[PDB]
Amino acid sequence: SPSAPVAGKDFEVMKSPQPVSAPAGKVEVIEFFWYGCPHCYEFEPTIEAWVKKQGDKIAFKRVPVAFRDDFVPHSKLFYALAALGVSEKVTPAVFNAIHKEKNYLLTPQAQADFLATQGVDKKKFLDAYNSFSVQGQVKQSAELLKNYNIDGVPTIVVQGKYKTGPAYTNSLEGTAQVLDFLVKQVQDKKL
Ligand SMILES: C[C@@H](Oc1ccc(Br)cc1)C(N)=O
């Protein structure tokens, strides 16, 4: 309690809370992230383990962020992987390509070529990349950026109402600690 996160400093209370897509008894958690964001990369093992530990207690999703036109292909990539059902399999290698191999995967052809080395059929991937369904999800993700007033990554949103992230806590461990506190406060009907 004396060490509890401080509202307005360690997390932000949104003036316009957003609809929650989680069912009763689950806390919704959203991570806005960008494949090219170093803190998002570093945070992956931390948030993966925490989400897996919560299990059915939460409904977790990621939303890709393209702050610039040049990075819209990274949001298309995110939704194309999900459409193919290979996200869990290849996403570590995608992060590795960008952050360690200097392959920024900025075009659909570079993505397809890389993903083929990971066992993804290029025609299937490019069909997903260019599909109307993925284009719809990308346009939606940009509307979500606006609706949650997101101006940095990674940003974690709890129950459509509480935002945290290293912009707030100045550390990834602090982000995880605030997230855990927020979810517990929502479960206990304190937030
Ligand atoms: C890790 C790498 O940073 C980048 C991340 C995404 C993009 Br796109 C371009 C560069 C670096 N040069 O240290």
Numbering used by the authors: 7 to 197
Reported in the publication:
Disulfide-bond-forming protein A (DsbA) catalyzes the formation of the disulfide bonds necessary for the activity and stability of multiple substrate proteins, including many virulence factors. DsbA works in tandem with its membrane-embedded partner protein DsbB, which is required to maintain DsbA in its active, oxidized state. B. pseudomallei is a Gram-negative bacterium that is found predominantly in tropical areas and is the causative agent of the deadly disease melioidosis. Binding was characterized using NMR and X-ray crystallo­graphy. Both 1 and 2 bind to a transient (or ‘cryptic’) pocket on BpsDsbA located adjacent to the redox active site which is not observed in the apo BpsDsbA structure.
Oxidized BpsDsbA was co-crystallized with 1 in 60% Tacsimate (Hampton Research); the resulting crystals diffracted to a resolution of 1.84 Å on beamline MX2 at the Australian Synchrotron and belonged to space group P212121. The interactions between 1 and the protein are mostly hydrophobic, involving the side chains of Tyr110, Trp40, Phe77 and Leu112 from the original copy of the protein and Val12, Ala13 and Lys15 of the next symmetry-related protein molecule in the crystal. Additionally, there are π-stacking interactions between the aromatic rings of the fragment and Tyr110 (4.1 Å, measured from the centroid of each ring). The fragment binds within 10 Å of the redox active-site residue Cys43. During refinement of the structure, the optimal occupancy of fragment 1 was found to be 0.62, suggesting that the observed density reflects a mixture of the apo and fragment-bound forms of the protein in the crystal. The signal was particularly intense for the Br atom, where difference density was visible even above the 20 r.m.s.d. level. Two additional residues, Ala72 and Lys108, showed a CSP of >0.02 p.p.m. for 1.
